[PDB]
């Protein structure tokens, strides 16, 4: 159903690098230029205190909606990715259910400022203390550490494009019906990413990329903390959490 479900030549791999970088550029949610410009715009002590005084449920609802907005851009990225729309609907949903949160966790390093350990949230930069009302301090600290580690790699926009395409197209996800088609698309996207790193003298980042188990651990922690919150405020999740968020993380 697609050229990239079979062996691709060097010229086809070059074409794939460009296509992936284009798909990412058109769906990145926030502009890198905007994120860097806004670094000097930091929440005041008064503003941090205001977020800390919010109820646990109010903060969970806000963060669930921010995650859902980010995920909607990843769904559009997937739709634009060569070969993804040629996979069967079962497989597209398996790949998105397993990988959309992983892609958001990678993308968010762009919005993280390693100089002062702050993230861009609701118009300004704030530290992990902004999220204290959620009552999931280990998960927040793990997300900040993850962004800090990716920030140390000094990714270009094109490297994030290619690395996130590969995070999404993972033939090991349980539930894939057309596993061999996904394996070949993954192989070609791996070649595109590695070709780009070779061409730009950036192959040294490969040994520095986080292990898959790290992204899995973050996703598992998020689902675990959500289950704890849901037990405390079931009607908040039922009535006020976004439907897409529930489809991805609380089985509908």
């Amino acid at each position: 159903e697609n050229l990239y479900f079979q062996g691709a030549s060097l010229t086809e791999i070059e074409h794939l690098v460009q296509s992936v970088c284009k798909s990412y550029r058109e769906t990145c949610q926030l502009r890198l230029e905007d994120l860097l410009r806004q670094r000097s715009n930091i929440f005041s002590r008064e503003e941090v205190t205001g977020y800390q005084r919010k109820s646990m449920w109010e903060m969970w609802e806000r963060c669930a909606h921010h995650l859902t907005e980010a995920i909607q851009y990843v769904v559009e990225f997937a739709k634009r990715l060569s070969g993804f729309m040629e996979l069967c609907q079962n497989d597209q949903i398996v790949l998105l259910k397993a990988g959309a949160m992983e892609v958001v966790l990678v993308r968010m390093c762009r919005a993280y400022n390693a100089d002062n350990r702050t993230v861009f949230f609701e118009g300004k930069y704030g530290g992990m203390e902004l999220f204290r009302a959620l009552g999931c301090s280990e998960l927040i600290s793990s997300i900040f550490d993850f962004s800090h580690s990716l920030s140390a790699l000094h990714f270009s926009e094109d490297e994030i494009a290619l690395y996130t395409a590969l995070v999404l197209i993972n033939a090991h996800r349980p539930g894939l019906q057309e596993k061999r088609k996904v394996e070949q698309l993954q192989y070609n996207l791996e070649l595109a990413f590695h070709h780009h790193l070779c061409k730009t003298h950036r192959q040294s980042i490969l040994a520095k990329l986080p292990p898959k188990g790290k992204l899995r651990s973050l996703c598992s922690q998020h689902v675990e903390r959500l289950q704890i919150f849901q037990h405390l405020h079931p009607i908040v999740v039922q009535a006020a959490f976004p439907p897409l968020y529930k489809e991805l993380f609380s089985g509908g």
Binding site: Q72, K79, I93, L96, P243, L244, E247, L248, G252
Partner: peptide, 12 residues
């Protein structure tokens, strides 16, 4: 029983 992904995937 929320199903949104199928709508997003099928919307052009």
């Amino acid at each position: 029983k929320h199903k949104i992904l199928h709508r997003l995937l099928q919307d052009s």
